[PDB]
Ligand binder design. Structure first.
Ligand SMILES: Nc1ncnc2c1ncn2[C@@H]1O[C@H](COP(=O)(O)OP(=O)(O)OP(O)(O)=S)[C@@H](O)[C@H]1O
Ligand SMILES: Nc1ncnc2c1ncn2[C@@H]1O[C@H](COP(=O)(O)OP(=O)(O)O)[C@@H](O)[C@H]1O
Ligand SMILES: Nc1ncnc2c1ncn2[C@@H]1O[C@H](COP(=O)(O)OP(=O)(O)O)[C@@H](O)[C@H]1O
Lengths: 18, 579, 567
């Protein structure tokens, strides 16, 4: 009767003011 | 970096860091590791609440007071906060830049040392999730080179599984074992911390009070380890002392207050710890006489054993008392157990041994081992005793239990402890083990075959020896035999039953009167020699309770609140008058 | 300030409702806060128990001054999870907002932060606790505490578990009475003392949905709103007990009769109601009524279950009918578990185990949770003979103590549920023919079969052995008419009219109904015989329009003859 046990950061772009 | 990192040395001068007491051996090992040319990163591994963090923080306090070696002097200890550093990054390079910035400050100052509490967290996921650029990888070259020294704190379970999986990080650090040396050091340690705790609550701890707190928590509070739990009970006692002085009352902390504090943590009745209830224990036997009677030895044997336990003469590691009741079924063996828990105001633990009639059933009480379906579910016996450390354990029909169950009880009686599948240590020495068997009655009640009868004085004892292995009998403190109920006792049992029914009706507002002759008739039919007093409850239930209930809802009882019981001689059937 | 509101300042101006009772619970919360370390109270509880109100009541007490001098100047702020999380929708942006808020509280000493539903958030919770500069109040559900707090050693050590238990029945009405003057002033109409006390009892017994105290407060406000809104409020300046029950019908989803008090009234009508829809076997239903009559009187042990019933005979002996009607009459949800599937280790584990998933911890025991989901629901068991003897033993345990304990630790009380069982041992023995040159009837007494199949202790604990009389031929004829009537109403919507001869009903009755199988085959026999022939014609043929149908039988060939008219 055994049982088997199964087992954010992104770059951004900047826009300078026109 | 200042937000993420706090200077322990600067903080220690102001205060906050408690004085470290009696850790010279542990501290000396740390300095030796720190003075090493390479891999000078001591790791403190110990159980929860063993002063693991205090040792690292204490080093800063010791340096401030100049009680450390000259090489250690002129050094700064920095406590890194992993949570603050991880929070607010929200970018791939935010964590790396701040972490690298922190390392640069430590690298610039050779004397500076870092402290990372719960260092196991960084190796799992230090900087990024789903990426291999973790915090540990960043410091692995630096730690090997020896540019920066890092102190670590980890639990044994966390150190074994989360940590040491990566051999590269593990080798750099140097494992230092931390264990509480003795109970006497803890009381000594609390004395050093007594001024800080006393000032916060504006209370004073007596010498007897501080020693009493550590001892009481050890025996009763098993949720936490000895150093932390001892500090916790003396800390909570101050709060109790704070509430009571509404207007110019005494601020001293008494042992009675501490006794109440330990009781709250364990949620026990508090009667066992306090000695003010000696009167109840003194009259425990007399009270039991009002309860199930007819066995002068059962009440005397059980009451005497409890008294010695409170007096301090009980077994240090064995249960309070081990007793086997061999007598006819229905003579009160089971009731003595349930009539003693109510009187003592403690929980009652009852297990049906008949259910545990096969070898596979024993695994239910201790749990299935790892890698199986039942590992998730804890053992029934271990869960019950852990949940209720102070309670009455009742085993019925022990003789029918599989031999495997008997083996489990051997360690329980001899050592007072049982280990479940999870490996937790279940300590329930306070419980009084009582077992009830019906094996002996058969031999004595039955007459010997043949023309001339034979003495049955030793037949009952012989049966116990055959059914129960000798090793099991040795652990048992005493074996008590229950004599057959006399006619007067059987009639007395009915009187209690009518009183119980009368008391139940009194609350409802109905008054019941039962003829004395009617009680005698009920006694004969209800009581059976082989079954003892077992059928008396059913006879009283069906015969009397069912008819009265009908009138209670609607009839004479609802309007008049009066009822009577009579017997018909011609029909030999009870007749009830409702008014 | 913007992210977290000030409860203490709010109570000073108003809005917060005064807290009545909970003196011991509030006392412990004050005690932990005064501690040097591990001073973070945790108001563990359930939804509607008032844990959030306890925090609001604690803030009111501080301004009132019913607290120690150390706690007199403390300020409780309730962190708004929605405010900080909303408007960011990013990972780490939310944390930055929390850092700023934490800095403000850290700067001011003796500041208390209240994180309602803290389990939802749980990186920064651990540092504030470890620092100890600001103590924090946390409200988490009992289930979430095991999942999150128990698993994390650091969180558990800092937070102290304060058990928040629901008040007793008497306590719940007292809370409403304490808060009744506030409500009466708000809408200018009052509730009778009988009405408020009755609201607590009627709400919990029938709705059984949110919380014992929460339902009481919600039911009183709902009743007042309906009465005051109605124009009759001028003439009606008080709330009748029945008026609340009528309003409770909206949140009950059952008729007013069910909600109406029927503790003693149901007994008389229930007996008549069982006979209204069931023909004959008055003795059998009388046995069922007698056992439940005991519970209503109340002259019994509280732990003992409400009632114990038993059924014997062939499959389909009205076990579903009487149980469904009994459940309807008692206004209790019908819960039925079939022992027919419990014939293997995996299947028998289902009573207390969680077959759906080992990972799943919420379900636990399926049979056990069913009682928890509906406290008053009836439990119907069938074909218990099949089940293993070991499974049957657990039934004996609950019957004696009237309580059960799940593997997960949940405790179920059987004091409010009636247990009935169905047995079909009779059909197997009677159908068999004696091994003799001349056959003999093999029918045996039902009571004899119960004794051999089940252990003696089961019968002893059982109040009585109930044997349901076998079906009668007159009932079968009526049953045939009911199915035709059911088919008849279904055809009237389409516009088809079906007429069945009296002889036709009798003809189907003899072959269809079986003694061993009861009325189950008759049902199936009526579907194939009538639905199949008309079905072809309905799609294409004479019955496409008009729908004139006639049913008759031919005596010579003993076969049903169907006449179709185009009409
Ligand atoms: N001396 C006594 N005084 C009063 N009641 C007694 C006495 N001896 C036995 N009884 C009653 O006998 C009944 C059964 O006694 P137990 O020792 O509990 O046996 P049991 O077989 O466990 O009983 P059950 O639980 O009723 S099947 C209870 O009602 C007891 O209170
Ligand atoms: N040797 C000691 N000297 C002084 N205080 C101690 C000592 N051991 C324990 N303590 C006190 O008890 C606490 C133990 O908790 P700690 O070891 O920090 O827990 P954890 O290892 O779970 O982080 C210390 O913080 C301190 O207050
Ligand atoms: N013991 C109590 N005393 C006073 N009000 C209570 C009590 N228990 C619950 N309440 C009521 O509960 C309502 C909702 O608060 P609460 O139950 O704490 O919310 P939640 O279900 O979100 O935890 C409040 O209006 C409060 O009056």
């Amino acid at each position: 009767k055994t049982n088997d046990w199964l087992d954010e950061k992104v770059r951004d772009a900047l826009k300078p003011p026109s | 970096t200042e937000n993420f990192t706090t200077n322990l040395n600067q903080l220690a001068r102001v205060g906050g860091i408690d004085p470290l007491i009696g850790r010279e051996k542990e501290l000396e090992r740390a300095i030796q590791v720190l003075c090493r040319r390479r891999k000078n990163n001591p790791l403190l591994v110990g159980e929860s609440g063993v002063g693991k963090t205090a040792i690292a923080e204490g080093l800063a306090w010791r340096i401030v007071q100049g009680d450390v070696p000259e090489v250690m002097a002129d050094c700064t200890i920095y406590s890194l906060d992993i949570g603050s550093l991880l929070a607010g990054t929200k970018y791939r390079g935010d964590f790396e830049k701040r972490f690298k910035a922190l390392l640069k400050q430590l690298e610039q100052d050779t004397n500076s040392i870092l402290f990372i509490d719960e260092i196991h967290t960084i190796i799992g996921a230090g900087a990024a999730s789903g990426g291999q650029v973790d915090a540990a990888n960043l410091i692995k070259p630096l730690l090997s080179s020896g540019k920066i020294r890092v102190i670590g704190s980890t639990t044994y379970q966390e150190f074994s599984n989360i940590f040491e999986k990566d051999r590269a990080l593990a080798r750099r650090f140097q494992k230092i074992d931390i264990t509480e040396p003795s109970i006497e050091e803890t009381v000594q340690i609390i004395n050093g911390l007594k001024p800080k705790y006393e000032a916060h609550h504006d209370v004073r701890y007596t010498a007897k009070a501080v020693r009493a707190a550590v001892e009481l928590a050890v025996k009763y509070i098993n949720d936490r380890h000895l150093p932390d739990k001892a500090i916790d009970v003396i800390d909570e006692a101050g709060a109790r002392a704070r509430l009571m002085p509404v207007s110019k009352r005494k601020k001293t902390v008494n042992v009675a207050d501490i006794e109440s504090v330990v009781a709250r943590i364990a949620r026990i009745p508090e009667k066992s710890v306090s000695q003010s209830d000696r009167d109840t224990l003194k009259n425990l036997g007399d009270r039991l006489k009002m309860l199930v009677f007819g066995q002068d030895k059962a009440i005397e044997a059980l009451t005497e054993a409890i008294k010695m336990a409170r007096a301090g003469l009980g077994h240090e590691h064995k249960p309070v008392g081990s007793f086997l009741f061999a007598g006819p079924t229905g003579v009160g063996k089971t009731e003595v157990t349930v009539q003693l828990s109510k009187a003592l105001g403690i929980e009652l633990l009852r297990f049906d041994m008949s259910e545990y009639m096969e070898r596979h059933t024993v695994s239910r009480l201790i749990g299935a081992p790892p890698g199986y379906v039942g590992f998730d579910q804890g053992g029934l016996l271990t869960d019950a005793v852990i949940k209720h450390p102070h309670a009455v354990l009742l085993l019925d029909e022990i003789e029918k239990a599989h031999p495997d169950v008997f083996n489990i009880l051997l360690q329980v009686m001899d050592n007072g402890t049982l280990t479940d599948n999870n490996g937790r240590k279940a300590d329930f020495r306070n419980v009084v083990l009582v077992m009830t068997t019906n094996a002996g009655v058969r031999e004595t009640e039955r007459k010997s075959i043949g023309l001339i009868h034979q003495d049955n004085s030793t037949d009952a004892m012989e049966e116990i020896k055959k059914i129960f292995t000798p090793e099991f009998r040795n652990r048992l403190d005493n074996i008590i035999w229950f004599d057959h109920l006399s006619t007067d006792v059987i009639h007395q049992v009915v009187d209690k039953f009518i009183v119980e029914l009368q008391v139940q009706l009194d609350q409802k507002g109905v008054s019941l009167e039962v003829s004395q002759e009617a009680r005698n008739w009920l006694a004969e039919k209800g009581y059976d020699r082989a079954m003892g007093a077992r059928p008396m409850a059913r006879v009283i239930q069906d015969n009397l309770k069912k008819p009265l209930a009908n009138e209670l809802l609607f009839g004479s009882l609802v309007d008049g609140g009066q009822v009577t019981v009579a017997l018909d001689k011609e029909k030999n059937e009870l007749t009830y008058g409702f008014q």
